[PDB]
Amino acid sequence: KSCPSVCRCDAGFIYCNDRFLTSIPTGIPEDATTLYLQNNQINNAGIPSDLKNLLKVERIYLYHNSLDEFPTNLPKYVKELHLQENNIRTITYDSLSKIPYLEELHLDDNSVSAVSIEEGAFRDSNYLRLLFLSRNHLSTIPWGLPRTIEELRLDDNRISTISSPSLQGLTSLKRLVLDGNLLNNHGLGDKVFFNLVNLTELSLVRNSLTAAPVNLPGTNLRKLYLQDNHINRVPPNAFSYLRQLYRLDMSNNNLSNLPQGIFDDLDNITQLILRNNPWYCGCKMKWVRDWLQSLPVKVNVRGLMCQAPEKVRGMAIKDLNAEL
Template sequence: MQFSPGASCPEECRCDNSFVYCNERSLTSVPLGIQEGYKVLYLHNNQINNAGFPVELHNLASVEIVYLYGNQLDEFPINLPKNTRVLHLQENNIQTISRAALAQLTRLEELHLDDNSISTVGVEEGAFREAVSLKLLFLTKNHLSSVPIGLPEDLKELRLDENRIAVIAEEAFQNVTRLQRLLLDGNLLTDEGIAPGTFQDLVNLRELALARNSLTFPPPLLPSQSLVKLSLQENQIDQIPVAAFAPLNRLEKLDISSNQLQTLTQGVFDGLSSLLKHLMVRNNPWRCDCAV
């Protein structure tokens, strides 16, 4: 069905072609009267709280992209347009996410939740799995202490950087085998906090970022047939087992900068193929002498 923007536009907003501009107007709720036909709804930088979403908004079928960053939400909102594909909720104070809220958004593909106050206990188990079409999930700069349980199967990119994650359970990524990009920079991960085999079933993973953690050696059993980029800079790595990188025959970029490496075992890079283009080793306390 084809929609064309109606003549009516909420008086608080400005409507232009397929866009509704209600941003930066000190609104505390979503205005009534938005017509079918508009595809993009700008509601960012207001004072909208969780009570400010009228039921009629959910039935607005033409809206596909919603900007709600910089508001006063403390829970994941309900009654969002049912066909929303891209949702920006960053820079709120969201603390809880329920399964019911995400179950309303079966077409959601891209979800931005950066810069909120989401903790592990605030995410209902399996909540993200309810968003069955979700492919991109951004949770940078929250208060998570572990990876949320129950991620959607079609997920391709997951950003969990700048959280407080200290533990990754072996089953954390069990059902997300289509994942291509995983960012875990700036957490509290130690060698013991990453269960053996955590990453090995991610057979499509192309990028794994583990910078700014507290690892003392690279995680074992990395996905060997797909990994192209591996970031391990700014950890506490002081040794690299000779076979650590041997299976990674597609690796093109490896960063082990700013660790505690003084020496490297002979042959540690021998398994890396000619595909490797970038190897960063700067800012390590290298021992430059003739000792073997």
């Protein structure tokens, strides 16, 4: 039981946070389990060589430090690693090779771009399940990502493109978050989402989609968020095969008309949110009125009301008799 003077130690929990450290203290107990190193001014040269030997460390909190690249020399068996609010740009295969049992990784609020990541950095990370890259400088999705991933948060980046191979192979992915990016349908590869069998949430809030994306996986897709884009259109096959989808939101978009029977595969739809769309109730909208009346009471529909013509503005599409 030897605990560094600056820090305080209690039964494997090492509290070295908020102590203006520029370096990690040398005398860490061998029975270390969780490392509280957050809220320090720690840079990459402040990690001692002996840190690697702390073989019982499973959780490390290094958020809100001064790290400018991926920390090497971390305890060989880390499982939980929180690097948010650092200045990390570079990430190399070698660095990640050092902690191959890593399971969840928080790089939120850093300065990583796709190029600042070595190609194939993750080839050994055969246990990574959670990868959070929220609020970085990514402009695309990195080609080499481990099959084991289950959650992938990429919100508020500068992503404008998504190659097919970046997402293909992620056959375990369940949640994919691309809110707050610069995506438009030109930026989408052919079947980028197509192979994500295990996908449960797709969240594309706050981009520049002008059309509902196609070739989505319908085996498990349960929630689908498309708000705050500029979607003009629903291609005929957009919601194809989504037999498990119970939630779909296209609020704050630019839809005025729906193709006939786009919602025909939505066997499990329960929540359909279309507030703030410029719905135009003409002879093209008549099928929708029917479909609404044929819809089970269970199902919750919101915002599906006429904006045009002014004549019938604000009236529920389910309740109209005559429009043209």
